[PDB]
Design an enzyme around this catalytic site. Structure first.
Site, PDB file in Angstrom:
ATOM      1  N   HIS A   1       1.039  -1.369   0.270  1.00 38.54           N
ATOM      2  CA  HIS A   1       0.532   0.041  -0.202  1.00 38.54           C
ATOM      3  C   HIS A   1       0.849   1.346  -0.189  1.00 38.54           C
ATOM      4  CE1 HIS A   1      -2.692  -3.226   1.568  1.00 38.54           C
ATOM      5  NE2 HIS A   1      -3.301  -2.157   0.967  1.00 38.54           N
TER       6      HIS A   1
ATOM      7  N   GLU B   1       3.803  -2.327   7.256  1.00 39.51           N
ATOM      8  CA  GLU B   1       4.394  -1.649   5.971  1.00 39.51           C
ATOM      9  C   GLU B   1       6.138  -1.195   6.572  1.00 39.51           C
ATOM     10  OE1 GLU B   1       1.747  -1.335   2.668  1.00 39.51           O
ATOM     11  OE2 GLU B   1       1.391  -2.868   3.134  1.00 39.51           O
TER      12      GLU B   1
ATOM     13  N   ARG C   1     -22.975  10.221  20.468  1.00 37.32           N
ATOM     14  CA  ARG C   1     -23.278  11.329  19.446  1.00 37.32           C
ATOM     15  C   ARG C   1     -25.009  10.775  19.186  1.00 37.32           C
ATOM     16  NH1 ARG C   1     -17.889  12.418  18.226  1.00 37.32           N
ATOM     17  NH2 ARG C   1     -17.341  14.600  18.695  1.00 37.32           N
TER      18      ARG C   1
HETATM   19  O1  URA Z   1     -15.170  13.924  19.750  1.00 35.71           O
HETATM   20  C1  URA Z   1     -13.943  14.340  18.977  1.00 35.71           C
HETATM   21  C2  URA Z   1     -13.359  15.065  18.006  1.00 35.71           C
HETATM   22  C3  URA Z   1     -12.419  14.650  17.825  1.00 35.71           C
HETATM   23  N1  URA Z   1     -11.805  13.443  17.334  1.00 35.71           N
HETATM   24  C4  URA Z   1     -12.703  12.709  17.693  1.00 35.71           C
HETATM   25  O2  URA Z   1     -12.307  11.665  16.965  1.00 35.71           O
HETATM   26  N2  URA Z   1     -13.786  12.709  18.531  1.00 35.71           N
END
Ligand code: URA
Lengths: 250, 244
Positions: B4, B76, B164
């Site tokens: 790669h 790699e 989230r």
């Molecule tokens: O909340 C966040 C902010 C930056 N990067 C991430 O992975 N999560």
């Protein structure tokens, strides 16, 4: 509005509700040019996004990068922008004797040897494509004149130990994956790749239609080396097949 | 020539240390912080530069997003003789006391990924090499930044695994429901997406690795961002100096 990673808005998509999603940014423009009025939208990291028109309908083409985690970002963000159907296209290596270079594989289910799929559904949940999509893919693949195989694909978070390669720095494979290649072969698994479990799981559990089609560019069990012509044709065929599959979906 | 990255052992000019940011776009800026930067290759998310630091060859190589793409680069590079891996990044904190601008040096990662299990069972700790962590802390402190040593949660997703809810479906799978508060109460500093894979595969394969990140946002509460970006890459190059 503007999504965090892909840097486009819903207006940018021109009402597109279907995306073709290859792994490699460098395939994106080539796929879009099989269609009408290709327009570059954005490029951030591994996400290169084009819009085009197919039979008078807007369609998005978006690369996903390598692996489930980069893919889960692209899919989630395209969904926020109104995309509802996702057609993964690629090339692959087969691990069964009867599957030849140039053949097409349409995935009917994936072995979940990833991590990201678990962020969407528990392991018990089947990493399965949408039935219409697999059906449209099979039809488009058959029409290409190529031999088509429907079946299970093993979907790994690594290229090396998770596909039981020993030609590596350590020459070692963790216990979980020792003997796994033969195991999949005997269970009829057709090929390995690294994004399908995550794509299929997240979409099947989130009301998104998805599926995977791949041209075979190598058979990992055979010493015979494929000539360059056959390879170029196969890559060409792969992307024409997914566009034709997209046509059937619309 | 590796599959790669598209470079050979000879291209690396003896380098045994690599700096590994996520984004290909950052590789050139990092390499130019050192001497005689030279482009080696670019293929997909992997852009590879070589440079010289206090007379020694050093590699800079992006890894793309997530454990799977990282795992390929690291393997790699290792095939090409690389033994030390310095991860630099920016990150979002989940502890109120951590400020935008501070540096976090990871002392261990919660393995919420998948790729790490391809190298060691879950019981194995995702932990940095001690010298690298030590170099990193020292280099971060010398930048004048506030430095936090602590545990990082390393997730295979950006959305549900970091709990989230502002998403397409608005749902988070049962495994991750309530996980953010859980990590907060256990003192976890931040989330990111590659450290568990990087640290496990290195700690279990005889390679030295560590992670340093600048904090560019706080989950709990410009272009201060650009200053942090720049500081973070200065920090990782200094840590490289200490390792050599
Ligand atoms: O909340 C966040 C902010 C930056 N990067 C991430 O992975 N999560």
């Amino acid at each position: 509005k503007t999504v965090f990673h892909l840097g486009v808005t819903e207006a940018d998509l021109n009402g597109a509700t279907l995306a073709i999603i290859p792994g490699d940014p460098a395939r994106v423009q080539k796929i879009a040019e099989l269609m009408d009025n290709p327009v570059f939208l954005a490029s951030h990291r591994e996400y290169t996004v084009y819009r085009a028109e197919l039979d008078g309908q807007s369609v998005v083409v978006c690369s996903t990068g390598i692996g489930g985690p980069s893919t889960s970002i692209a899919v989630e963000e395209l969904a926020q922008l109104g995309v509802r159907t996702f057609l993964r296209v690629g090339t692959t290596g087969a691990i069964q004797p009867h599957v030849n270079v140039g053949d097409m594989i349409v995935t009917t289910g994936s072995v979940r040897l990833d991590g990201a799929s678990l962020h969407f559904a528990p392991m018990e949940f089947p990493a399965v494509p949408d039935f219409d999509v697999a059906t449209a893919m099979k039809a488009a693949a058959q029409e290409s004149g190529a031999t088509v195989h429907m079946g299970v694909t093993a979907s790994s978070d690594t290229f090396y130990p998770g596909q039981e390669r020993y030609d590596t720095f350590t020459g070692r494979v963790v216990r979980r994956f020792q003997g796994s290649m033969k195991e999949w072969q005997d269970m009829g698994v057709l090929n390995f790749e690294m994004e399908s479990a995550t794509l299929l799981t997240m979409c099947a559990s989130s009301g998104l239609k998805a599926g995977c089609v791949a041209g075979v560019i190598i058979n990992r069990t055979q010493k015979e080396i494929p000539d360059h012509a056959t390879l170029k044709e196969t890559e060409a065929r792969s992307i024409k097949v997914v566009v034709e599959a997209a046509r059937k979906m619309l």
